[PDB]
Structures are given as structure tokens and as C-alpha cells.
């Protein structure tokens, strides 16, 4: 049933389409792309309807059941366009034994990536442009009259904006970017009611971010929660630039104060890590770097799995046998090239690495540490502030096939870590 796609333009569909699909099928459609190429996937037809517990289509950011799940679809609803620069996008088509449906029809394009203007990261991520789909926007709740839906929260939208069922600080507008993205800025508006002509706007809000949409981090500014100041009228746009660029997939806007009701229109700004030169995700997340390539110094519990160290995908983390081991005695090793950095994550009370060293090799037997000139010793990299939110740590491009991360300082819970390596082919 399974197929691989590498040609510039292609078609993907359920077996026998336009006929209804055969029962008890489990096929994988994998699209592969060269570095600097983006995968565009567009569905033309989709009928799987009967929890998708019968017939479903899974879209995977990487290898299925290794890389993160983008979405599961089982309706008459065509999935929205996807732009992947992971280099690999996979579909799993699962059919049951009852009521064969019409299936799905889709097409893909491999397009050369064009990095934005310089290497600027203030690109609108697609709220106004529609690049973010309606599917990608959700909310805690919506107003009863149904005239203020999450899908009306697009910046400069002409029909009200998003309003929740109640005005409280527990309500939020959520956007799933589908893939890990750099976030640098947020633009918000209020809304003047089409009916009453009443002006509703958020005066201040908090930012919550997640990589899986389960573990959340409130974007803190210092040691306390950052409270962004928003709009003072229902029409004018207010842009808040993040003082420290964020790496995330799920964005939540939680209003804290408002004028006469919560109304929100929104734009998100950022870019992809891959927009920067020689910054491809080398396969820890996607599963392109298989289990056989992941090793660690130690490992809490016998017969550990190597797919627990994967950045984002892993719903746990890497743990050393010793909870509290001495610095420089524990390490995670990846066998892969030019390496220009890593992305470090904590583990899902809570464990994350606060300072770390990096060592690299071509041999696997002779190792070097990235050296800070000032120290005359291996450079000491800033780690994470939080167990979920990843931190990208770039360094001077170094050629290697083996990379090790040595935890130096960590949270009171101890060493917990998930990891990706960044770089490109020679």
C-alpha cells in the first residue's frame, strides 16, 4: 500500500480513487525533499466519515509514530494546505472493514525555499493572509450568539472578532502553527460590533506556549509572568515585540484586562529555524536520525528506549541512571556534516538542563569541545528556563558526524533532556 514521493510535482490518493477504498488497509505515503526545498500538500477531495476510531488519515511531521503528529482527519472536511520545511512529511491511511468511503485526493509540490529579505524573523505567520487555516484557530469558548468565532480573530478581519462565552482571564484564543516555529512578535486589535457598534478590546494579556499543546509555559518576563499591554481602542493595531525570540508550535493569548468585553483580532510574527543558513533539523524530531544512532552515558532503568531523547516528539525525555550525577559525567550522543547548533528541551516535579557543554567528532574516538576563547576551556551554553519550551543554541559551523551534550547545571528535579541537532550537508 505504501509509497515514497521525490518528484517535483505529484499526486497522492486512497487506493483505487475515484472508487471507494478497500477495507483493512494500513498504508504510509512519505514525501521526501532536498534541503532548502519546502513541501506543499493540498487536498482536493476527502470523505472518510462514518474520535476517529474507524477510518482515519494521520499526517506526520517526519516518520510516522516517531515524529510529532500534525493532525488526524476522518470527515467530509478537506485538510488545509501544509507548508513543511522538515524535509519529510508522512501520511498514514487506515481503513476498517465497514462502509467503504470515497477516500481522499491530494497533490504535493517541492519548492525551493526563499529566505526572507535578509535573515529577518518578523514575517506575518498567516493570521491575516490565511496561511494559518481556520482549523489551526480555536478558543476556550465563543460567545453564545455565535457572531464572534475564533475564526474571526484574524488581524484586519471585517466581521467583529473573537469573543469568549464569558469575559474572564481563564479564556484564551489558541493557534496551532502545526510545526515548531520561531515566534518574535504579536499584533492585536479589538472589534467594533457589526450589530451594536460597541467597541470591545483587550487592554492587557499573557502569552502561553506549547510544543505538544499539553504542557504549557506562561511567557514570563524576569521571575514573574509577562503582562503584555494591548490596545486602547477597538480599531488601531498594537504590536508587542518579544524581547527574547521564542520557539514553539502552540500559541495561546490569555486576556487579563479588557474594555467592556473580550474581543480579539490577532497576527503572529516569526520565521522558521530553517530560514537561517545551515540550520536544518538533522532528524531527532522527525525520526530521520533513528534509534540506533542515539546513545547516552547512563540511563535510568535497564533497557531504555533511544527514542525518548527526541526533541518535541518524545513525551518523556532522557534520564541518567543517577538522578543527581556530577557535571561532565553524563552525556547524550547523536550519530548523524556541518553542525551549527542544537535545540535543547527539558523532560515531561519537573526536570530541565540550565547549563551545558557540547563536544563533537568525525571519528567517534577523537573528540573536541566547542571552546570559548575567553575561558580557554569548553564554552558553557545557557540551557532552558522551563521543561517544555525549547531553546536553540547556535555556534560556529563545525564539521562532525558525532555530537554529545554534557549537562553542567540543571533544575532541582535533576537532569532531564530532549534534543535536536542543527546543520547541513557539506
Amino acid at each position, epitope marked *: 500500500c505504501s509509497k515514497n514521493f521525490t518528484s517535483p510535482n505529484g499526486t497522492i490518493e486512497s487506493p483505487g480513487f475515484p472508487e471507494k477504498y478497500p477495507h483493512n488497509l494500513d498504508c504510509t505515503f512519505t514525501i521526501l525533499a532536498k534541503p532548502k526545498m519546502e513541501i506543499i500538500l493540498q487536498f482536493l477531495i476527502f470523505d472518510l466519515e462514518h474520535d476517529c476510531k474507524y477510518d482515519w488519515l494521520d499526517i506526520w511531521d517526519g516518520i510516522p509514530h516517531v515524529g510529532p503528529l500534525i493532525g488526524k482527519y476522518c470527515g467530509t472536511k478537506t485538510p488545509s494546505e501544509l507548508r513543511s520545511s522538515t524535509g519529510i512529511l508522512s501520511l498514514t491511511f487506515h481503513t476498517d472493514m465497514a462502509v467503504a468511503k470515497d477516500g481522499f485526493s491530494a497533490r504535493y509540490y517541492l519548492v525551493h525555499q526563499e529566505p526572507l529579505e535578509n535573515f529577518q524573523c518578523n514575517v506575518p505567520l498567516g493570521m491575516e493572509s490565511g496561511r494559518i487555516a481556520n482549523e489551526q484557530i480555536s478558543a476556550s469558548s465563543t460567545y*453564545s*450568539d455565535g457572531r464572534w468565532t475564533p475564526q474571526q480573530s484574524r488581524l484586519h478581519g471585517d466581521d467583529n472578532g473573537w469573543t469568549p462565552n464569558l469575559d474572564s482571564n481563564k479564556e484564551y484564543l489558541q493557534v496551532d502553527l502545526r510545526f515548531l516555529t520561531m515566534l518574535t512578535a504579536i499584533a492585536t486589535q479589538g472589534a467594533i460590533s457589526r450589530e*451594536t*457598534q*460597541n467597541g470591545y478590546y483587550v487592554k492587557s494579556y499573557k502569552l502561553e506556549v506549547s510544543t505538544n499543546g499539553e504542557d504549557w509555559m506562561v511567557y514570563r518576563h524576569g521571575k514573574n509572568h509577562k503582562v503584555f499591554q494591548a490596545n486602547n481602542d477597538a480599531t488601531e493595531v498594537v504590536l508587542n515585540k518579544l524581547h527574547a525570540p521564542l520557539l514553539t508550535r502552540f500559541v495561546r493569548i490569555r486576556p487579563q484586562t479588557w474594555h*467592556s468585553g473580550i474581543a480579539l483580532r490577532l497576527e503572529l510574527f516569526g520565521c522558521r529555524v530553517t530560514d537561517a543558513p545551515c540550520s536544518n533539523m538533522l532528524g531527532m524530531l522527525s525520526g530521520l536520525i533513528a534509534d540506533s544512532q542515539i546513545s547516552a552515558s547512563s540511563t535510568q532503568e535497564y533497557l531504555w528506549s533511544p527514542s525518548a531523547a527526541r526533541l518535541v516528539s518524545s513525551r518523556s525525555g532522557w534520564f541518567p541512571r543517577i538522578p543527581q550525577a556530577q557535571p561532565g559525567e553524563e552525556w547524550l550522543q547523536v550519530d548523524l556534516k556541518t553542525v551549527k547548533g542544537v535545540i535543547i528541551q527539558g523532560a515531561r516535579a519537573r526536570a530541565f538542563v540550565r547549563k551545558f557543554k557540547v563536544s563533537y567528532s568525525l571519528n567517534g574516538k577523537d573528540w573536541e569541545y566547542i571552546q570559548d576563547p575567553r575561558t580557554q576551556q569548553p564554552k558553557l551554553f545557557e540551557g532552558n528556563m522551563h521543561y517544555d519550551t525549547p531553546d536553540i543554541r547556535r555556534f560556529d559551523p563545525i564539521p562532525a558526524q558525532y555530537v554529545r551534550v554534557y549537562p553542567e547545571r540543571w533544575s532541582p528535579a535533576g537532569i532531564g533532556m530532549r534534543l535536536e541537532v542543527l546543520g547541513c550537508d557539506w
Partner: antibody
Amino acid sequence: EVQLVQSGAEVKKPGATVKISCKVSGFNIKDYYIHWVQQAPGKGLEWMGRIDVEDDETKYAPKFQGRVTITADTSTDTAYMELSSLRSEDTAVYYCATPIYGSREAWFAYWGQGTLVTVSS
Amino acid sequence: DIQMTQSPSSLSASVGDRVTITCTASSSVSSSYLHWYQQKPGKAPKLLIYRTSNLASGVPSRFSGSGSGTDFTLTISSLQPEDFATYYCHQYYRSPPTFGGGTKVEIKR
């Protein structure tokens, strides 16, 4: 319990101006919305206008435009309707009303008792 | 603007009787935006129903309303002497807000 208390009845000569008072109380809170309605003796409810108390963003009916000014004092929870260039037909009961907080549907939940203006010479 | 017309203007109906007042719109009003008010002779209007004539507010059970788009209704299942008043419908689907002419309920006795 939200309660609006209006000014007393007045007689005002034709071509004069009348300001009447709507004292919001009971639940109050900021972001109150005040609307003025005119009931002619004959009958009918006619919407003069509304005011965002926090932001001075009055909306007026085209009929009373030019001739009605709505003001809010945030310090004392009182809203005012000023009717310029009075007419014989302006003799009516003027009501002030407010909707509930979260209602984007703007039903007039609470009303004032009514102020009678008798435009007479 | 969207003009509102309440058809029956005067109703003499006896006590304990089912009465029905129409309200009808020049355009289409969203269900959630039609409201109803009761005005006793010497008093300010009081809210009866606030969404599509569906949602009654701390008020007697006899009062019902229904409708969609153009035609909305207010119904008193057992009319009572207390219920003698003028009844107004209001729309806030598009500003400016508009009221109906009113229906003056009277009682046979």
C-alpha cells in the same frame, strides 16, 4: 441590585436646553453603557442615543443629531442628556436605560423611573 | 435601519386567555437580538424576554416568545389582570436600535 435614578420633571421654554441626570448605582462597575429613550405623551419609544461611560463614544439617532449631547461623569456615576433648541413636540418622558455587562445583544435590562420635560412658554 | 412593526395595536382579551402579539421586521433580525418590554400605565418599561423572544428574565411562566428572521411572537398563555400593559419589541441586530409601535392589551371582564 442595579438601579438608575433620574432627575426631576422640568418645564423649559421653547428654544431652551435641558440636561437630565441618570445616577447609576447598585452594582455599577466601570464600562457601563447608558441609552436615552424618548416616550412622547401620544406613545412610542424612540432611541435618542447611547454613551460608553469609560470612553466618551456617544452614538446618536439621526433625528436628535445636532440637538442631543450625552455626557458621563466617571467620578460620580451619573450620565446626562442635554437637549438643545427644544420643540413643542419635545415634551415627553425621557428614560435612561443600561444593558447587562456581557450582553453584546444590548437588551435594556435596567431602566430609570422617567423624567418629564414640558416645553411650554 | 431595520424598522419594527407590531401588528395588533389593541387587544381586548378576557382573563385566563391565550394572547398572541406579533412583531415583524423590515429586514432579518438575528434570533439572539430581538427583545420584549412591558410598560405598565404610569411606569418605565421592564424587560420580559431578551433573545428571540426565547429567554424570559425573573418573570411569570405564561409569557413565551418565538421567531426567526422577520416574524417574531410574544404569547401569554393565561392572560391576567396584572398583564394589562403596552408591549414593545426591540432589535439590536443593526444600530440604530428600533422599537415597535406597541400592543395595548386590555381585559374583558
